[PDB]
Amino acid sequence: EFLHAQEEVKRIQSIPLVIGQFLEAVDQNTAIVGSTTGSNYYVRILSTIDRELLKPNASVALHKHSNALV
Amino acid sequence: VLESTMVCVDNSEYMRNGDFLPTRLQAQQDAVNIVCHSKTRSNPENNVGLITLANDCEVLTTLTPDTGRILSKLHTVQPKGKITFCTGIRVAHLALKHRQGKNHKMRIIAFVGSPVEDNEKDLVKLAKRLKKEKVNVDIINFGEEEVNTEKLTAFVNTLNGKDGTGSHLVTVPPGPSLADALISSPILAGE
Amino acid sequence: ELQAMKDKIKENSEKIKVNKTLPYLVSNVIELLDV
Amino acid sequence: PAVDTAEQVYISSLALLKMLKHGRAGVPMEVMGLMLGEFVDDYTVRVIDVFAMPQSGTGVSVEAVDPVFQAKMLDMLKQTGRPEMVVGWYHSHPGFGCWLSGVDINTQQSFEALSERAVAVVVDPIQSVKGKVVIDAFRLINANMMVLGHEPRQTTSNLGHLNKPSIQALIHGLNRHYYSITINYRKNELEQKMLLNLHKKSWMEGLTLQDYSEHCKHNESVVKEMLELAKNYNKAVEEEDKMTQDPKRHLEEHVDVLMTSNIVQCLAAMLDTVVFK
Amino acid sequence: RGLAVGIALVMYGRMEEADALIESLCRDKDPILRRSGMYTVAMAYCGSGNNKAIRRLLHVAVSDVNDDVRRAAVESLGFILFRTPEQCPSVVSLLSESYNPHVRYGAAMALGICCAGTGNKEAINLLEPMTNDPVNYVRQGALIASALIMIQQTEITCPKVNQFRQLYSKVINDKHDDVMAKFGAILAQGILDAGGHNVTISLQ
Amino acid sequence: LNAKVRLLREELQLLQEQGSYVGEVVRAMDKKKVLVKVHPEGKFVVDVDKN
Amino acid sequence: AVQKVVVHPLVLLSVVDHFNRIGKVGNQKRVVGVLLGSWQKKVLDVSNSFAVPFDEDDKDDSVWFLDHDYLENMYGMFKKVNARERIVGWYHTGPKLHKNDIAINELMKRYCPNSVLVIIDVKPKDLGLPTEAYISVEEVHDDGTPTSKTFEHVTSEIGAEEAEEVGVEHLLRDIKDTTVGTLSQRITNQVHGLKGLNSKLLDIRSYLEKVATGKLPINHQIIYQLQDVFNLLPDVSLQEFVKAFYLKTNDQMVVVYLASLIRSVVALHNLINNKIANRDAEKKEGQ
Amino acid sequence: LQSVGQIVGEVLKQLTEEKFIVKATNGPRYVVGCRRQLDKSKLKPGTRVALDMTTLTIMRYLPREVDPLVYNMSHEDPGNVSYSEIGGLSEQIRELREVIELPLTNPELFQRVGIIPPKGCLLYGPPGTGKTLLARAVASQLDCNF
Amino acid sequence: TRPANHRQLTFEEIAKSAKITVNEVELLVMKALSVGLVKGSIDEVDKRVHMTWVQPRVLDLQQIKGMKDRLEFWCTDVKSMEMLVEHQAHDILT
Amino acid sequence: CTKIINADSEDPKYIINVKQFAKFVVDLSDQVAPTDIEEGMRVGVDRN
Ligand SMILES: Nc1ncnc2c1ncn2[C@@H]1O[C@H](COP(=O)(O)OP(=O)(O)O)[C@@H](O)[C@H]1O
């Protein structure tokens, strides 16, 4: 059952994602992003995105509907 | 009279016969046209289908109340192959079973002018079976009368059983006019 | 067959009617290409 | 006589596949169709099959029902051998979640007036992405009961609940005007097998050998990445010990993939070499 | 559902003469019939600690696809093990921290049935964290199981009954509390106060 | 393993849940109501939750 | 002709539902319908299907009542509902052909030039796909034998659009297997492959016995194909192949050995950490 | 009826073989996938692209933008004058025609000689001795893009 | 007639076959290859010919019986090794 | 409204310029006379 979970994670990390700018790290596994659509959202960071590499005002890719910083 | 009917039309090579002016093909075409017209005019809610008896039987129009499409489809029928009356009648029985309207009388008219080559035992057995499924077979004979008269009489007798006048046989050895004979036949008199 | 073709004229006409739901949009025809 | 929160719509596999296919076969249009089935007693809506409807041009509304088409196909399917009434109607809301608009409420009201146990099914092809089938079933509430204050739907069993209603539907009136219904699937064993046949792997695939050149190249790629991860793992463990993880996890993943791939290919090679001679 | 419970009741007390029917039901494809099979196992090997039945129930509880069947299997396990109340927590504790909320609810109810009217300590300890869960019915089952276990227990004998009574009062008196959690709390108060503090619940 | 699986399931649920807007508080007018302007669309009075 | 045909899960489920429907409403030997799809080169894609009323005599094997009017009516209706789908074949749920199938295919070829017959076995097999694809070709046998109109096998496959694919995955989530190679599943896959190969060899052997005893005639194409099989059998006793195979086995096993060494080292490190943590905890608890 | 318009955008970076960062003009920038029948090599930064509306996949490339000025400049250029219509300046015709045409048609002459082909010439002169006509003639003869 | 196990053919045995001295078996095999009937190679250094293909032809009942026997042996081997593998890995098969 | 496209006699097919949003075309209906409705001044378009 732990399998299929990595699978669903890699599937939510899909191709048609939307690019945006990661503005600030509000807290663990959550942050504020600004989608290139022109609006700011308070979305949830997926796990294993190298919080160290997730610096302020970086280029990120978000789920097309959940806007999660995939 | 609520009714579902199947016109079984023979289109074997023997329809090339020119005895019926202009040819047997147009003679039987006008015959089916007139009989379908009469039956449709009688209780238009009745429905009509068309079976062709060839080397391998075929169905050209499932039970429908319209006669124009039936006539148009039949117009393209051509003489070819040989008649298979058993397969034709069984296909007609299947189609009547499949008829949408169950409040109808199961009748089948067949222009069977040809030398029918079928065994007498299975012939009478099939006639009795059709009687069991309550079929009314009308048989138009024009052709090898000397050959098929006894078999058509066996049809009529077995189907009637006792008082079962529903089945009819009309034979027309001479060729004055097939349409005239059929209109002045007892089958269409009640319609 | 002409009657069936007239029925197909009818289906074309109803196709136009359904796809021509009037509240259209207006757009420039900027650029024009073909393959 | 008030409907309780145990009524459940049993959507057949065929019905679901047809509905989702039609949604993605006409997105972004609001496709519509009837749902042929049979209410069993009072707590079941067994949706045997669904019913595609021609694109009526006027979006989705009662004007798109096309009664002549509906009745003629009803009779024709009945002839085919599918004698079921018209239990509810399905219609897609591409992208815009699952809920009822004003026209949707009007159409559902007409359906309830025809027979006050039908349902309105909503499917979202865009958001029904792989692994998630966002479908919903709804029925209206009566203004007289709502004003009287009695709850719209009785609660005699712990079923019916157990579901978190979407905030989208809450805003669009998930309880003020209508209420959701639980969706069950009647997965027969035969249908499940025939679905499995989709990605079922043929014995050729099972017993075939992966290309040896590509196999060696992949082995080298993974082994070199494992070497780098081993260097990082040593650095991490040494610094941890001196002071008193991701490298270990990645190393475990790489070792597992190497072992499985290599053992699989070697065993397949032996099976083949002493099965085919 | 009714037929399932009825079959289970019919095949009561028959420790081993039922194995054929248990096998048939457990093999059957209908999830409700598999649940009936779990109930049949419980009623058959009721109050016996029969390890074959325990193994079957547990394997179903972690193998079958229907969460209803999993929950029923865990409850039936409790039914099997009530005769040695201290023994069941050792098993159902590992389930209690399960990812399947139906399995968690089954663990709650199994502990409650097993240690009913016993005032066991580790059972209450396990129930508490479950009493604080994000899911609704798991909280409901935890509350009801705690009521069953602590029925007729003074604070001195069980130094947590006052805390759970206050917890019941709090959970009942709340704005945002889930309906099912409130229902479980109300039934828990009823059970804990059942019989005017004169009747206990014992399966033997 | 159970902790791993539970973490992944919670992550799946939360990610599949949609996002949230960000707004600047113009004024905390009235109890339980907060006037907040959200870029780019207009400014709304929100019914603040309990936490 | 057409070289490949790919059926869809929607078609599969529609066929299964049709057969179950007919069986429930009355015992029957077969159920028949039409297959709508689209053409892209000689790769037909059956994207939909629909039943048609049909019954035949089991004894005479020459009388049946396919309803062409029904067929055309519902084809027009499905054309109205969705445009880009046209009659491409017909399906029947018969484990065996019949002497009528050719006549019904003659009936269907009026609607489609390259009409494809599809035998769909509702009974679930375990080795191959449940659908078989046939096409009627009649020609002067260059074999000089009397020519009789008969079918020809067509490569068949199961494929789904994204819509049907997500739907089927959601239906199958309960028993769906991991979409990734796990060692146990791969071993089971090899075992299943051996099962399939054994079954195919047994079937070929039964046919060969039938021909040898004489209950059947001899198909030159079949003999040619089996000749090609036996002639394509490899030779695994050759030294220049044995050496290469040993080399590759040694390479794979050195990779496996390095992997196992790393895994053991990691396990020992974990055990060391556990020992340290346990001793620290016990010391703290004592003091 | 069964056609639907795509979305015009421009690639910005060839990410992993299947992922392309495409900026929808007058809109946001996505990461999208490329359908089967396309030339990933053909797809390069700055190339126009027709993404799908729903799945935002690269349906097919599209040629680079055309500026209005350059369009009016190039696509509308009526040039049809034979060298016979340039009466004098036979020598200057020789030099021009040489430099412009010969490297275009039959560059193997330059390859064999060893010299690299020339690019451009000044062609300066008093106000109306004939320069636009002299260029129009060579443009018409070459029938290339003027 | 020669099976794939020992499909190597020799100039000498071809000579013992259709009457020709061993200086033109090369040309005979060459003509076969060219017309596209058999495939393989010729190693005249050791005076042998390797075949890996034969234009299939209609056969006789005795030949089919022998082929059936060969396939009997092949199927028996396949079943034996299937049983071996399943028994060995019984504790990991899903 | 920006134009009436001559009203094409019947089927007026008016043009609208919904501000900051878009420009569309409309039949309107439900009013008395296609001409006395409006020529070039403010109007209320229905939502859907
Ligand atoms: N050698 C020539 N033969 C024919 N016409 C000429 C010649 N030289 C100049 N002209 C005429 O003089 C005009 C010069 O126009 P144009 O070429 O546009 O300007 P410029 O002479 O400055 O290049 C042309 O229209 C052309 O007809």
Ligand SMILES: [Zn+2]
């Ligand atoms: Zn709607």
